[PDB]
């Protein structure tokens, strides 16, 4: 237990084991026009993050796996060269070139998965 953002410089795998500690300080704490505008702004970012979470089919879960594969043109590095080798900050810095494409592919994959389940449940 390191606290909020404790594993900032740690490896990605080490920070992955403590995800609740960062999730519980996104809308709570201690939070006149300035003060109220930030709260309304803050809640929109949480709903921005939760709406994308639900549209991919990861509603209410901190670790969810998908159906899309990994494209090598995004990044050629290996698993042991990521989880025990890099921090989340530099990872987000390097992969910040194709995030929108990945988000769109996740959206469409979850949509087709929902359509497939609706087709299958008709027997």
């Amino acid at each position: 237990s390191l606290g909020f953002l404790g594993a900032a410089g740690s490896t990605m795998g080490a920070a992955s084991m403590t995800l609740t500690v960062q999730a519980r300080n996104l809308l709570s704490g201690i939070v006149g026009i300035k003060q109220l505008q930030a709260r309304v702004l803050a809640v929109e970012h949480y709903l921005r993050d939760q709406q994308l979470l639900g549209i991919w089919g990861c509603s209410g879960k901190l670790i969810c796996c998908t159906n899309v594969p990994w494209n090598s043109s995004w990044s050629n590095r290996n698993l042991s060269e990521i989880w025990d080798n890099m921090t989340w900050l530099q990872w987000d810095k390097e992969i910040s070139n194709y995030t929108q494409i990945i988000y769109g592919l996740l959206e469409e994959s979850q949509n087709q998965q929902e359509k497939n389940e609706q087709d299958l449940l008709a027997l």
Partner: nanobody
Amino acid sequence: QGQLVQSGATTTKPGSSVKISCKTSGYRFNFYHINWIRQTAGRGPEWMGWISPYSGDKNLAPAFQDRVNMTTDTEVPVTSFTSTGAAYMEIRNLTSDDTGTYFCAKGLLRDGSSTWLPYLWGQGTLLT
């Protein structure tokens, strides 16, 4: 990426103690261990020892237990993930039998079962 540059190729007669520098660039100098390995002509490649430029915890071979001295200074952060550091190494009871080419190599990872493994090597220096 990352690159490591070594000292000059100077020679000295037995009985002395020489220091070899190793300057790092292009990576977090604190995130990986550093190893020193010597290639001798009349012997095989010998792992001498590694130190941690983050914890300062050292571990050498028993053959170099009381004869080799290895130190580092603090890093200079270039960016959030790039740093520049240095590493120095000396031998106390030095003779002419330890002649060879010395290499400084940064560690492989910062976690796992192959952390300190010498991964990224230097240019090599020629001794007496």
